[PDB]
Amino acid sequence: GSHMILIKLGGSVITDKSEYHKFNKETVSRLADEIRRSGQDVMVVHGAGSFGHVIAKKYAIQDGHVDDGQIPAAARIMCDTRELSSMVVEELLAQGIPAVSVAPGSCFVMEDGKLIVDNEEPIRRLADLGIMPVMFGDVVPDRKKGFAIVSGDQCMEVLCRMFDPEKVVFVSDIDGLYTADPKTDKKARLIGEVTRKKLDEALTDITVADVTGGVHSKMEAMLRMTDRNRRCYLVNGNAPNRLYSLLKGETVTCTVAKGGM
Amino acid sequence: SHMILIKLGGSVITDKSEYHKFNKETVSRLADEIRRSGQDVMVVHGAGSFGHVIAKKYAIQDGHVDDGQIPAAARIMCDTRELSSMVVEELLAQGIPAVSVAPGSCFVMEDGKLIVDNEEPIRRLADLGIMPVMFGDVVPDRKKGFAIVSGDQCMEVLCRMFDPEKVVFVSDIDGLYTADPKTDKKARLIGEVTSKMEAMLRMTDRNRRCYLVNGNAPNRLYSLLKGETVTCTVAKGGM
Ligand SMILES: Nc1ncnc2c1ncn2[C@@H]1O[C@H](COP(=O)(O)OP(=O)(O)OP(=O)(O)O)[C@@H](O)[C@H]1O
Ligand SMILES: Nc1ncnc2c1ncn2[C@@H]1O[C@H](COP(=O)(O)OP(=O)(O)O)[C@@H](O)[C@H]1O
Ligand SMILES: C=C(C)CCOP(=O)(O)OP(=O)(O)O
Ligand SMILES: C=C(C)CCOP(=O)(O)O
């Protein structure tokens, strides 16, 4: 029975998603301070954001190795993501939280979606030493393909099964899960609770307005981080002291998922 | 088949006496000499002042003995990963795709030996054309909590793994001497080797040789990679 909270710092918060290689030092500094002020044992995962998505879109890194022109682009992403992780760890180090960057593209491989972690000793030993192992979204060598992209969500799934955290927190730049896109649609209302029946009901699309199933995908990503016990919270990292309050256990504006899968 | 294993020592790529001081101008030139050589290489680099300064300060070489070392070891880990990012940036600028592989995040150690239980990741990176770059770092130890792996230890592991054609050690000396060059200029230069002489000689066998070249001398590493004879120290014969 661990008392650990597994947190994901989405790339849309720690980075300016619209400006390549832009770091929101201000925001990550406050979030790290909120994590320290909470006094909770945590494990941090962060996304790539602008430190990965801008190049991955131009050279189609997600589709794998098709031409030799993506090799310099793939190497640039891995340098950018490791540089971004340095900026995240620096904020944690300044808050008295010893951590270390663990780049998945240099430790693990991928196979049809699964980020394969065959050796758990380095991460487990670093966690036993008090140095928080920080995994992040990265370009990872694939087996059936040349390279593949791992997201912060997938790094969260691996550490979730490895350490069995008591709570999972998703830190995004929005108030939570909505019935549509708030940055586009305004008629959408935040979804407060996410369960299995709502995930199954999310497959219904009478007017055919969510073809890609974005709401269903975001719901499933939260439920798979939940047990019969463990809960998952999607909180706005741009709201000052909101993550701190969530880590203290008090009620905040967020999206809660429970029940498990 | 024709790969050359090169270690960019911390004495040239950093200012060993000034903490967190990167030699950007020197590293870019060495990377340009690697690109101009046209040879397939696998680059290792040391930590220099990005590790040794804080390591000696907190006795990291002795292992985990007190809680005050854990924040120090994490600071060294961040420094080495930040130094490797600067080294990779110079490699990417020279059209050499490479990626940092921190031994403290991938492997473990036991009795002063770097243990690599999984070779698939670093090999698939080399197969993709993205040169995996290891470096001196603090690594979780199996008996001391943590330990310090050197750039030379990363060279020995990568040598037996990929079986390079040539081993080159890049430092601020012209080669091995009978004494310390900085504190003793009367020392004589050693040309061929058939304590650190056995470290170079154990990485050679049959035709593969191990060289120790001056990275501060412009175009000396380039000429060595081109096969020309330069001022250096070479081990021959094998063990
Ligand atoms: N007999 C000797 N031969 C060569 N160097 C010597 C000798 N005696 C003392 N030294 C000192 O050792 C230093 C060599 O640096 P060293 O090889 O430890 O660093 P590096 O290989 O460049 O980087 P790294 O820290 O990654 O190994 C020289 O600066 C020199 O002053
Ligand atoms: N149904 C939805 N509910 C809430 N937010 C959504 C939805 N669809 C799209 N978004 C947008 O997606 C963004 C998050 O992007 P993404 O990269 O998927 O996650 P992260 O925030 O971890 O980077 C949010 O800023 C939000 O505006
Ligand atoms: C964490 C540290 C200090 C690694 C040092 O590696 P080096 O390759 O610079 O080590 P030496 O050979 O100089 O001992
Ligand atoms: C290499 C990339 C783009 C990883 C992206 O990870 P994410 O920010 O969690 O979606």
UniProtKB/TrEMBL annotation, chain A:
Keywords: ATP-binding, Isoprene biosynthesis, Kinase, Nucleotide-binding, Transferase. This is Isopentenyl phosphate kinase. The lineage of its organism: Archaea, Methanobacteriati, Thermoplasmatota, Thermoplasmata, Methanomassiliicoccales. Belongs to the isopentenyl phosphate kinase family. The keyword Transcription regulation does not apply. GO terms for molecular function: ATP binding; isopentenyl phosphate kinase activity; kinase activity. It comes from Methanomethylophilus alvi. The keyword Membrane does not apply. It is an enzyme of class 2 (transferase). Homodimer. One of its GO terms (cellular component) is cytosol.
